[PDB]
Amino acid sequence: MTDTEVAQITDNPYKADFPILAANPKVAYLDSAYTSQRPRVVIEAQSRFYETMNANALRGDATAAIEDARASIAKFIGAVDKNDKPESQQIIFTRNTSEALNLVASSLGRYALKPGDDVVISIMEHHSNIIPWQQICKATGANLVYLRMNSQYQITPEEIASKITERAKIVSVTHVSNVLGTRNDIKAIAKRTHAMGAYMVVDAAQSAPHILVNVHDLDCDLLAFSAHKMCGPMGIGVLWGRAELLNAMPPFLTGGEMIDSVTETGAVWAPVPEKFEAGTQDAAGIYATGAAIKYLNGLDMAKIEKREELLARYLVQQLCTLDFVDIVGSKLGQNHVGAVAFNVRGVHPHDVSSILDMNNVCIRAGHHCAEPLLIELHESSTCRASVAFYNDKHDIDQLIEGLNQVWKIF
């Protein structure tokens, strides 16, 4: 990296906005791929909703707040129509990405899957984008098909054309792997998927917080991500879908608020998106998620993207200077979005993170909910460090100094 690049990540104009980091300046939090830290504005927005907006008790606001939040979320992912109006009615709220993928697998699977059909996923998938397809395929008689990686941890155009055939009905691929950091060519996968007449589902849990996402450039039919990974509150997931697909898909959870009317023996469903939101929703979490969108918009998501590119490059570069460290993913920093998996040679990841915790460095150890991928690469356990825009050069240097300490003991 150039000297001006190192100077940019040396400075940190962002970490002061996060109360947990400002109050604990010695801690290097490098596990944003699991969940983010919360900006003060997001925490305050949640408390302000409960203090002043709960159940519109001061009406003599809250309903408009949820709509305003859907619109800002829809804009943020490029879900705007021809006339620059946000597609707010195509935003559905869940608890997390996992529930959104269970919704798609159950509703779209019941709608479309017949025995003999193919559901195509990749070997990189998070468990939440694997097991729901295992379940719905067993229930419908469809076949679960896996896209494989090449040697540089990419899905090749040849693999895309060979696995996505005329038998394919649903294709669900992660946008960015939570272990390898690989950014998949979702646009190219969707092109082949649509040429076979199949639906395209995108797990954007690791791409929404780190790279620009435009649903209309990505050519996808459905897309899901989690708010708690992009500086939002916990307990809020987002599902976007094409309007007419959401209209045709049957409901997932049923009960109050998702109907138009109910009799003893039947019920009539409410329109999208209320059709997919059963019971009282987390209005405070939705409001705080809108505050997270406004916060990220204020920092300019393009400038967040570039800074996190530089932090990923510095992380891999410093990790490569350690002869006792083997990177599990690609060895090029330009090929890592967010996460970098690695292992200290001959040391349990439990022992690595235990020493780093003593050095006030927070990283992730274990399977990272991607066990089929690790089985594929003959890895039983791995360490994972990840960068966010509120990290800096000093956080990564703290990791390196802690890793050198690990080698001293082991």
By CB under 8 A, the residues from 98 to 117 that bind a second copy are 98-99, 101-102
The option from ligand PLP, a second copy, none interacting with 299 (CB < 5 to 8 A, set by class) reads none
Q: Residue 238 is inside which H or E element, if any?
A: strand 237-241
Beta strands in 187-227 (DSSP E): 199-203, 222-226
The residues, any chain, with a CB within 8 Å of residue 384's CB and separated by 6 or more, are 31, 33, 179, 339, 340, 341, 342, 363, 364, 365, 368
- Please state, in angstroms and rounded to a whole number, the distance separating the CA atoms of residues 170 and 167: 10
Pick from 36, 106, 172, 174: which binds ligand PLP (CB under 6 A)?
A: 174
Is residue 206 part of an annotated ligand binding site? yes
Is residue 353 part of an annotated ligand binding site? no
402 class by beta-carbon count within 10 Å (0-12 exposed, 13-18 middle, 19+ buried): buried
Buried residues in 313-324 as b, exposed as e (16+ CB within 10 A) = bbbbebbeebee
Pick from 61, 375, 394, 404: which binds a second copy (CB under 8 A)?
A: 375
Nearer to a second copy, 265 or 321 (CB): 265
- Please state, in angstroms and rounded to a whole number, the distance separating the CA atoms of residues 383 and 365: 5
The DSSP bridge pattern shows strands 361-362 and 28-29 to be parallel
Is residue 98 part of an annotated ligand binding site? yes
Pick from 157, 279, 303, 375: which binds ligand PLP (CB under 6 A)?
A: 279
The option from ligand PLP, a second copy, none interacting with 206 (CB < 5 to 8 A, set by class) reads ligand PLP
Is residue 164 within 8 Å of residue 196, measured between CB atoms? yes
Nearer to a second copy, 240 or 333 (CB): 240
Sign of CA dihedral 329, 331, 336, 338: positive
Sites for ligand PLP among residues 192-211 (CB under 6 A): 203, 205-206
**Minimum distance from residue 148 beta carbon to ligand PLP (Å):** 18
Pick from 2, 4, 280, 321: which binds a second copy (CB under 8 A)?
A: 280
- As annotated, the active-site residues are 369
Sites for a second copy among residues 30-59 (CB under 8 A): 31, 34-35, 37-38, 42-44, 46-47, 50-52, 54-59
Give the total of residues touching ligand PLP (CB under 6 A): 16
Output the residue with the shortest Cβ distance to ligand PLP: 279
- Cβ neighbours around 236 below 10 Å, total: 25
The residues, any chain, with a CB within 8 Å of residue 105's CB and separated by 6 or more, are 132, 133, 135, 136, 172
Is residue 226 part of an annotated ligand binding site? yes
| Residue 362 makes contact with a second copy by CB under 8 A | yes
Pick from 178, 289, 335, 359: which binds ligand PLP (CB under 6 A)?
A: 178
H-only helix segments in 221-282: 243-248
The binding site for pyridoxal 5'-phosphate consists of: 98, 126, 206, 226, 228, 280
> Which residues in this chain contact ligand PLP in the complex, by CB under 6 A?
96-98, 126, 128-129, 174, 178, 203, 205-206, 226, 256, 279-280, 369
